[PDB]
């Protein structure tokens, strides 16, 4: 009863969206899946090493959020709130933030 709207929404999102932006969504889905698997295994067995799971999970939530931020800034429609942030100055910023995130994740995990 509520599947017609879902299919219509997906169809819309499969023509009204430019390329080099769907790929971002694909990578985002990948991160969301690796996170779901991590959480599922944690629930199934529990956590003996807590910092291991916690930092092997943040390393995914942070990446997902950085990807969403990059998709927001890259999007041409959302170029009124962000003034003077060109796409290149967004990608480089994302790369820098990601580097910090990964370095901290490596330090925190066992």
């Amino acid at each position: 009863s509520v599947v017609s709207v879902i299919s219509r929404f997906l169809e819309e999102y499969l023509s009204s969206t430019p390329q080099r932006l769907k790929l971002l969504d694909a990578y985002l889905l990948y991160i969301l899946l690796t996170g779901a698997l991590q959480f599922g295994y944690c629930l199934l067995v529990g956590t003996f090493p807590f910092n291991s799971f916690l930092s092997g999970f943040i390393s995914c939530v942070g990446s997902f959020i950085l990807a969403v931020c990059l998709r927001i800034q890259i999007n041409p429609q959302n170029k009124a709130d962000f003034q003077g942030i060109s796409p290149e100055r967004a990608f480089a910023d994302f790369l820098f933030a990601s580097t910090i995130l990964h370095l901290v994740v490596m330090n925190f995990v066992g």
Partner: protein, 655 residues
Amino acid sequence: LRLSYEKQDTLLKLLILSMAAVLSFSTRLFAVLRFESVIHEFDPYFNYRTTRFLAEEGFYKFHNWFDDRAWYPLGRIIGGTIYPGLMITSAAIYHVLHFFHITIDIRNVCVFLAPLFSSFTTIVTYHLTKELKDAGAGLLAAAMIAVVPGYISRSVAGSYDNEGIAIFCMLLTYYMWIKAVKTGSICWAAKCALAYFYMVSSWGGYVFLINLIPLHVLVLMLTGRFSHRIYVAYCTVYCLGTILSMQISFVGFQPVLSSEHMAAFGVFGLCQIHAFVDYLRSKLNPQQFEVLFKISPWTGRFYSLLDPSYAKNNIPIIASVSEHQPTTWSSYYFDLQLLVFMFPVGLYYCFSNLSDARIFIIMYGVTSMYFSAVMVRLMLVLAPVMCILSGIGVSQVLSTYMKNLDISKNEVASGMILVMAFFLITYTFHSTWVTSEAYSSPSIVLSARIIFDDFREAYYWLRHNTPEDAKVMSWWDYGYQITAMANRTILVDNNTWNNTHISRVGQAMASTEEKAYEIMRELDVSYVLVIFGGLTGYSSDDINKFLWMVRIGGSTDTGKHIKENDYYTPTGEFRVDREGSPVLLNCLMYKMCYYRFGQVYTEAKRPPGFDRVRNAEIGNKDFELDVLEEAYTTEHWLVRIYKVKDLDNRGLSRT
């Protein structure tokens, strides 16, 4: 004249900024000109003794470090129980100088690090206020910050405590967050996460930062101003900030499973649950959308700030310290003069023009003010925000009255600039006076010039004329000093991380001589140090605080006979004269605080054996300590050190 407007403007901004910096750095420098440059009070004596061990021995030999010279039987870990912020900013500032062959001392770059970090506060404040509004109202903040009396009390030259270096970190983090919200750049947010990390590692009051930010975003979300800028900033800052915060061994896994850092997380999930909904609404139509339409509790310490009476009823240790009581009309004006008036005007000027950045300053001021109201010690947070608000208000008034002048009614227009200048002058005067007369007094140098330096002589004696394995036992107040100066193994420290060992020590005092001796054998204590203070007039005698000892020793399972309302007289008055309660005249504390004292003539015309502090004669005139033979008594009878006698040789009952 010939100089262009640009050059003139920038040379004035630079001149004023430099002057303000020098002013700030040279007004918290009174305790040093009077008495030599020595660290003062009970806390800076531990930070010092730690930064010193971190300087000579590499960082990796301090992150994990078991100090077996405090809580003798137990032993406290310094590696993972202290925020390593001050020690790594001082070690780094000392190493850089050594690399440049300045070869300064570690007791001289550690005393002048509070005023130095109160000279960088000025610059950061000037920018943090040059963001909310024009540069015009930024300078007027810096100078006021330079000479704010309440802040100066906690950051004089000699107070090596993470409270004059915390404000700087808070200001830097706020400036980063304000820039991230204003622009929305990922880089700016990151540079904020890093500031928070460098603040969660130096100041225990970082829960403020993970509770004002969610509050800020919630307000910027309830009025309908939540744009993608705030979303990007908040999410990035949350993720990176929390993961960075967990690094520190003391914090552990607190941010993810505590009820203090549940705010940020809740607002995170309510951020997503909002952005996604907006996105869906944009791609859909009303009809279809309508169709589709372990965690620990609040720890008592931080809970005391919400409920101002929780401390008194439950925690019998947080209410002891003098600076843990509500503020009066005489503290706000004494520490902040002309700022208290400016605060409402600054608020009104903010509320007039709401914006993404300001709705944060208003929230900070509204919260910080209440938190300062509950406890006087929190005046740290309150003074800078108030100063920023004051900067945004006086400048606005001046700007309003600066255009009316014909050169740029005229008499009325001037009357305002003149009144404002007079108010600013009065403020500078009062601030200097407050810094000079009162908020600058060395803790270990009782003075009236006559100098009483017993607090040092006794510790030096201990450090030189005792076996290298003594167990000097004294109230938890003096634990930091005895380990930094006497260099013995004090039974209880000032961290108070075990509320049973301290109770034990309390029980060992204010009890019969036998019970005390029995309790003074399990811990193998040898010496005993009690701060008499009776002959010199010292306000904080050990007898003066002996009520806390009797009220923190009789509040555990081990001891209950020490119940309160038993040392008092029939009328419930704590009199230490001959008419006082018999049990009081017999406790170990009083017995060792008035031994062979009812003979000295302290006053010109008074009974021999008088007590200056309590203005009453002693009751137990003459007695002989059964177990505690005397060992030392300083010239002014300000600190008396006894020594627990060993078990009797022939095995007799006594001694």
